[PDB]
Amino acid sequence: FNILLATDSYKVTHYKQYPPNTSKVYSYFECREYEETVFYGLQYILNKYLKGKVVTKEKIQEAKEVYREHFQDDVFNERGWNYILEKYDGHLPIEVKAVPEGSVIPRGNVLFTVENTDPECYWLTNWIETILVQSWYPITVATNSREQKKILAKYLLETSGNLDGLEYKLHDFGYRGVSSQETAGIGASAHLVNFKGTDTVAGIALIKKYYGTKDPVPGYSVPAAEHSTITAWGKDHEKDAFEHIVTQFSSVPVSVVSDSYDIYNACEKIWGEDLRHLIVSRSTEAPLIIRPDSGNPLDTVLKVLDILGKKFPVTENSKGYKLLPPYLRVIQGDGVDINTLQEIVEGMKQKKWSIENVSFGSGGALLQKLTRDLLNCSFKCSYVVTNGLGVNVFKDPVADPNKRSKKGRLSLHRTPAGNFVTLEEGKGDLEEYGHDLLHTVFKNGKVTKSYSFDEVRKNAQLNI
Amino acid sequence: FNILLATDSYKVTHYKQYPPNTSKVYSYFECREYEETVFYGLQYILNKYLKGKVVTKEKIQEAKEVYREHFQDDVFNERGWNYILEKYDGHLPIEVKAVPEGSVIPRGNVLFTVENTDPECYWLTNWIETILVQSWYPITVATNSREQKKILAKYLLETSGNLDGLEYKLHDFGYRGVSSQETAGIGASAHLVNFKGTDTVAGIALIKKYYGTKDPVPGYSVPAAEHSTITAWGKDHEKDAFEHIVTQFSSVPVSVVSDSYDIYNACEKIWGEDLRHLIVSRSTEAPLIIRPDSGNPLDTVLKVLDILGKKFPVTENSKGYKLLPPYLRVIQGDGVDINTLQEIVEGMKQKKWSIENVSFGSGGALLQKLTRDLLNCSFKCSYVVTNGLGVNVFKDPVADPNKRSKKGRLSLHRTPAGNFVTLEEGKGDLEEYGHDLLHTVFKNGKVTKSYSFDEVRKNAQLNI
Numbered sequence: 001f002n003i004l005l006a007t008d009s010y011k012v013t014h015y016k017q018y019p020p021n022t023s024k025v026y027s028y029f030e031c032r033e034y035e036e037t038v039f040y041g042l043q044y045i046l047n048k049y050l051k052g053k054v055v056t057k058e059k060i061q062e063a064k065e066v067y068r069e070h071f072q073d074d075v076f077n078e079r080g081w082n083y084i085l086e087k088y089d090g091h092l093p094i095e096v097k098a099v100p101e102g103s104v105i106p107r108g109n110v111l112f113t114v115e116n117t118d119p120e121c122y123w124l125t126n127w128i129e130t131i132l133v134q135s136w137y138p139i140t141v142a143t144n145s146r147e148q149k150k151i152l153a154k155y156l157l158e159t160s161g162n163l164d165g166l167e168y169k170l171h172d173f174g175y176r177g178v179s180s181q182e183t184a185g186i187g188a189s190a191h192l193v194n195f196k197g198t199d200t201v202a203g204i205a206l207i208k209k210y211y212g213t214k215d216p217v218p219g220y221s222v223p224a225a226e227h228s229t230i231t232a233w234g235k236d237h238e239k240d241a242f243e244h245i246v247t248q249f250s251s252v253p254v255s256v257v258s259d260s261y262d263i264y265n266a267c268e269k270i271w272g273e274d275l276r277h278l279i280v281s282r283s284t285e286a287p288l289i290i291r292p293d294s295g296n297p298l299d300t301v302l303k304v305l306d307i308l309g310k311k312f313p314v315t316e317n318s319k320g321y322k323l324l325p326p327y328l329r330v331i332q333g334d335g336v337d338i339n340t341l342q343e344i345v346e347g348m349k350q351k352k353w354s355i356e357n358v359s360f361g362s363g364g365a366l367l368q369k370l371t372r373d374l375l376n377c378s379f380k381c382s383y384v385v386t387n388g389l390g391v392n393v394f395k396d397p398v399a400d401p402n403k404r405s406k407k408g409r410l411s412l413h414r415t416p417a418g419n420f421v422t423l424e425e426g427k428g429d430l431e432e433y434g435h436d437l438l439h440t441v442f443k444n445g446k447v448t449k450s451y452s453f454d455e456v457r458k459n460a461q462l463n464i
Numbered sequence: 465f466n467i468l469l470a471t472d473s474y475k476v477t478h479y480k481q482y483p484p485n486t487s488k489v490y491s492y493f494e495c496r497e498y499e500e501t502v503f504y505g506l507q508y509i510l511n512k513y514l515k516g517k518v519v520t521k522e523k524i525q526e527a528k529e530v531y532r533e534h535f536q537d538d539v540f541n542e543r544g545w546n547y548i549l550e551k552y553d554g555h556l557p558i559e560v561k562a563v564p565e566g567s568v569i570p571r572g573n574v575l576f577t578v579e580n581t582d583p584e585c586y587w588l589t590n591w592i593e594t595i596l597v598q599s600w601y602p603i604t605v606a607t608n609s610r611e612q613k614k615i616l617a618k619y620l621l622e623t624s625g626n627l628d629g630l631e632y633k634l635h636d637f638g639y640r641g642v643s644s645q646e647t648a649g650i651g652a653s654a655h656l657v658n659f660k661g662t663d664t665v666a667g668i669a670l671i672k673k674y675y676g677t678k679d680p681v682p683g684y685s686v687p688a689a690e691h692s693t694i695t696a697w698g699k700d701h702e703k704d705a706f707e708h709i710v711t712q713f714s715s716v717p718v719s720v721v722s723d724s725y726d727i728y729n730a731c732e733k734i735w736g737e738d739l740r741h742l743i744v745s746r747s748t749e750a751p752l753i754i755r756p757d758s759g760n761p762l763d764t765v766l767k768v769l770d771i772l773g774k775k776f777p778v779t780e781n782s783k784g785y786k787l788l789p790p791y792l793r794v795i796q797g798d799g800v801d802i803n804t805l806q807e808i809v810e811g812m813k814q815k816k817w818s819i820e821n822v823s824f825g826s827g828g829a830l831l832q833k834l835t836r837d838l839l840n841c842s843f844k845c846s847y848v849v850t851n852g853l854g855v856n857v858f859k860d861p862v863a864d865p866n867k868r869s870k871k872g873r874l875s876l877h878r879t880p881a882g883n884f885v886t887l888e889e890g891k892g893d894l895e896e897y898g899h900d901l902l903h904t905v906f907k908n909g910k911v912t913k914s915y916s917f918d919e920v921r922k923n924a925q926l927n928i
Binding site: 180 | 480489640641645646651687688690695708713725758827869
């Protein structure tokens with residue numbers, strides 16, 4: 001990996017576009033005005049991509065060649081990178097300040113800032129924009145995942161009286177549905193800020209390498225069937241597949257996909273009649289989890305629950321909501337996103353079904369159907385020093401007031417009523433509020449402030 | 465990278481779930497039910513992740529450890545992996561057959577197949593589903609991009625005599641809008657199947673390492689300003705910023721973002737009056753490219769063109785469409801996707817503007833807004849051998865006919881009228897439809913057939 005290469009190609013030419021005698025470029029990141037945002041992921045990028053000796057003579061040579069053919073011209077500035085190699089032993093003369101990892105922060109607030117610490121490296125601030133802006137993805141995943149937890153929290157507490165096992169209510173099925181291997185690890189780790197359930201163990205490895213956990217089980221999964229594992233038995237032998245699978249996993253939880261041919265036949269006749277004797281004997285810590293995977297998500301879940309309620313003992317909990325026996329649950333792992341999740345739990349509630357009966361899985365929508373625009377994650381220059389004089393800078397496009405950026409040196413503060421305010425134009429120096437909530441996390445090639453994933457999770461906790 | 469870790473965690477348990485006495489699992493990939501897709505990206509995955517000695521004693525031990533805690537139980541199949549290590553020196557006993565890289569194939573067709581070559585490794589076929597299915601992404605990016613090229617082609621041909629410079633009409637701005645560094649490389653490579661413009665040089669690195677090309681210039685970019693290099697001058701000094709940038713890049717094409725404060729003032733007063741004398745002196749090989757970046761994308765382009773047509777000499781084409789001077793062009797890089805691109809170009813046509821005036825740029829919509837659901841990319845088991853008997857296998861959910869999978873052994877064939885058919889149930893063995901269009905590309909740890917990026921581009925050409 002070459003950091004000289006890991007930027008928007010046109011930024012190669014930017015060192016020549018700044019006002020002459022510019023010694024300082026100061027830039028910031030915000031989720032421009034999902035009213036709250038989980039700040040997560042910078043620490044990964046800092047350690048993996050920016051830390052330590054990132055400049056070498058070889059990497060400078062490679063970039064020279066690569067940009068020579070890309071631009072069909074020598075626009076690449078060797079001198080600027082030679083300077084960093086020679087004066088700082090390839091360590092980047094940059095200071096990064098950020099709110100704590102896991103922080104839940106209202107939109108339109110400064111989340112991190114970037115400035116050069118050496119006047120010669122004024123151009124460096126915006127060179128690393130591209131790599132740092134990719135922090136939008138872990139942020140958006142963690143945020144969207146948290147918003148789903150809120151809906152589940154509301155309805156679980158409504159229908160059961162507590163939040164027991166909330167952190168297991170949404171499983172990450174996103175591995176195959178993401179754009180790459182690196183994305184799966186990043187996105188799975190972000191989901192894990194909020195829940196424990198994941199089919200992507202690369203997320204666990206990212207957590208341990210870059211954050212660290214104390215607790216013994218950072219993320220979990222259970223044995224589960226897939227379509228090939230049922231259909232391989234042949235159309236006429238679905239019961240045989242079911243019986244074989246639950247006996248192989250008699251002592252542990254097992255998820256079994258039940259819609260290969262006819263979900264409602266599988267629930268009523270196979271699970272509820274033919275194999276009913278093998279279900280009712282199961283332990284509370286080893287339920288059968290039936291997984292429908294097609295049709296309208298609400299209509300299916302409702303009819304599934306109706307069928308099971310007619311074949312198995314149903315209790316009514318203290319909140320007046322119907323409950324399956326402890327050895328039998330449902331997972332809805334198809335068509336679940338923040339919108340449909342809400343419709344399912346509400347529909348369940350309306351039909352007097354407790355949310356403890358059903359857990360959820362999401363894939364493409366949880367990890368892939370997300371963009372920069374969702375939270376308007378943006379990096380902008382707000383402050384420069386030219387001819388030894390500070391200048392507050394900004395954009396303010398005439399046709400779009402939502403695209404206006406903040407001016408001058410920024411700081412984040414706690415207000416008297418416990419809310420947040422970003423102070424612009426260096427007004428943080430007035431000390432009318434407490435201290436700036438941003439900490440220096442990176443300075444001169446070194447990570448200077450870090451958080452465990454135990455701290456991240458704690459920071460991202462719901463407010464109950 | 466450990467291939468034992470790069471699967472959906474539940475698949476670790478599937479060796480215990482297939483019918484006893486299974487010696488073969490045969491699975492296929494399709495874009496189920498955007499009527500035609502570009503098959504691109506499998507070669508990358510095969511070379512990076514699947515070829516050679518991918519199993520070592522250390523990787524088996526790591527997986528053992530990782531999976532023990534993830535499952536709270538020792539379900540990981542150490543026996544199967546040790547067999548591959550010991551018998552095949554860590555090389556995977558699978559055969560993969562695929563349509564040529566770059567192939568444009570209608571929906572509903574088999575694009576690749578996977579099966580084990582050793583009876584003991586029946587479980588291996590679907591172990592690698594997850595990694596292989598991530599093919600969806602370069603496929604979907606290659607397809608959506610090709611579809612955008614078709615719109616541009618249609619309208620360029622309509623308003624101009626021809627297709628000159630089509631391969632430069634859509635620039636990839638997606639680097640900061642994608643989920644990771646790896647995605648940025650894969651996605652930019654996929655765009656480069658159809659166009660030449662990219663700001664992500666990682667796309668070019670992927671090309672050369674994994675496909676290779678004899679073209680001396682596979683991807684390009686030009687000098688471009690960003691908001692920071694304009695705003696850093698101060699609001700009162702936008703003209704100074706413009707003048708400085710165009711003079712620094714007097715002899716090469718330069719893109720200059722012009723909406724910092726007021727796009728329409730920039731075009732009418734700054735470019736059109738104060739700096740007009742610096743623009744009209746430019747070479748045809750070195751135009752000023754004005755970049756609006758806010759407001760309604762069609763309304764802004766139309767007003768920009770109207771303004772510029774009033775300050776600069778306009779000629780009418782042989783096709784009757786209006787044309788800016790060769791030293792002056794526009795790039796629209798905000799809010800562009802397949803739907804809005806069509807609306808912009810149609811609105812331009814209605815106002816008698818040639819498409820040669822405006823080129824485009826897309827970011828998150830081009831490389832990130834896309835999902836596996838867009839082309840229904842899916843991997844399914846279609847055939848097994850149990851007790852030495854072949855079994856044609858499929859799923860067919862009662863509530864969703866669109867989710868039914870294909871049966872038995874598959875082959876892709878040219879029909880007499882020049883179209884495509886996928887033959888199911890081994891029917892390709894009746895030589896009624898010519899040779900199988902799928903070729904073995906991987907067998908027993910070796911890539912057996914590979915394509916240059918020159919072949920990919922040729923294969924993916926538009927049919928004019």
